[PDB]
Amino acid sequence: KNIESGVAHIHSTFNNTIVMITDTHGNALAWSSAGSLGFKGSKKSTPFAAQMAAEAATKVAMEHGLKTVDVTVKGPGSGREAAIRSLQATGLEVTAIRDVTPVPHXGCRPPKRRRV
RNA sequence: GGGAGACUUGAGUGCAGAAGAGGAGAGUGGAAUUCCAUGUGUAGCGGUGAAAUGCGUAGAUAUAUGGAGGAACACCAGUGGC
Numbered sequence: 001k002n003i004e005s006g007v008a009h010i011h012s013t014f015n016n017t018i019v020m021i022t023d024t025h026g027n028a029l030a031w032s033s034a035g036s037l038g039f040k041g042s043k044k045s046t047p048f049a050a051q052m053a054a055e056a057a058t059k060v061a062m063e064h065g066l067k068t069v070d071v072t073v074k075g076p077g078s079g080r081e082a083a084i085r086s087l088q089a090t091g092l093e094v095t096a097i098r099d100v101t102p103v104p105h106x107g108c109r110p111p112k113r114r115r116v
Numbered sequence: 117g118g119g120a121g122a123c124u125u126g127a128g129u130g131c132a133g134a135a136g137a138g139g140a141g142a143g144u145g146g147a148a149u150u151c152c153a154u155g156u157g158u159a160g161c162g163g164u165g166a167a168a169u170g171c172g173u174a175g176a177u178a179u180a181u182g183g184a185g186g187a188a189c190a191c192c193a194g195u196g197g198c
C-alpha cells in the first residue's frame with residue numbers, strides 16, 4: 001500500500017519500451033509502456049513514447065506513496081534516458097542508475113541475420 | 117657406379133632449457149537462453165518499411181525468488197599461439 005524505497009525497471013527494446021516500478025524486493029507496484037498509451041508501430045520506439053510511459057507509471061507509483069527509486073536500464077532502445085529523466089520530472093527521486101543488459105559469456109546461438 | 121677405409125658440416129641421439137586454444141580421457145565453473153514453480157502485478161506483449169499471424173484476463177510481457185536441462189565458452193584476445 002505505502003512504500004518509501006523502490007526500483008524502476010526500464011525494459012527498452014528497439015520496438016517498444018516498458019517501464020515497471022517495483023519495491024526494493026522486486027514486487028511490482030505500477031507499470032506502463034509505450035504500447036499501453038496508444039502508441040503503435042515505430043512511435044512505440046521513440047524517446048517521447050518512452051518519456052510518456054515513464055510519466056504514466058511514475059504518477060501511479062507515487063499515488064501509492066513512494067519517494068525515491070533506483071533505476072535499472074536494459075536493452076538497446078533509444079528511449080532509456082527519456083524515461084530516466086521523466087521519472088525525475090514527474091516527482092520521483094532517482095538515486096542510482098545501473099545497466100543490467102544481459103550478456104552471454106560465450107551462450108545460445110542467436111537467430112539468423114535478417115537477410116538471406 | 118661398385119669395393120675397402122677415413123671424415124663431420126646434412127640427418128639423428130645424449131645432455132640442458134623454452135613456449136603453446138596440439139591431441140585423447142574424466143571431472144568441473146559462471147554468464148545467458150528456454151522451460152517449470154511461486155509471489156508481486158495489469159492489459160497488453162511480440163513483430164514490420166508498414167502490418168498481420170502468434171502469445172495474454174484459463175493472469176501474459178515485466179519483476180522477484182528458486183528448480184530443471186542443453187549448448188556455447190564474455191573479458192583475456194593479438195596479420196597472437198599450436
Ligand SMILES: [Mg+2]
Ligand atoms: Mg524464419
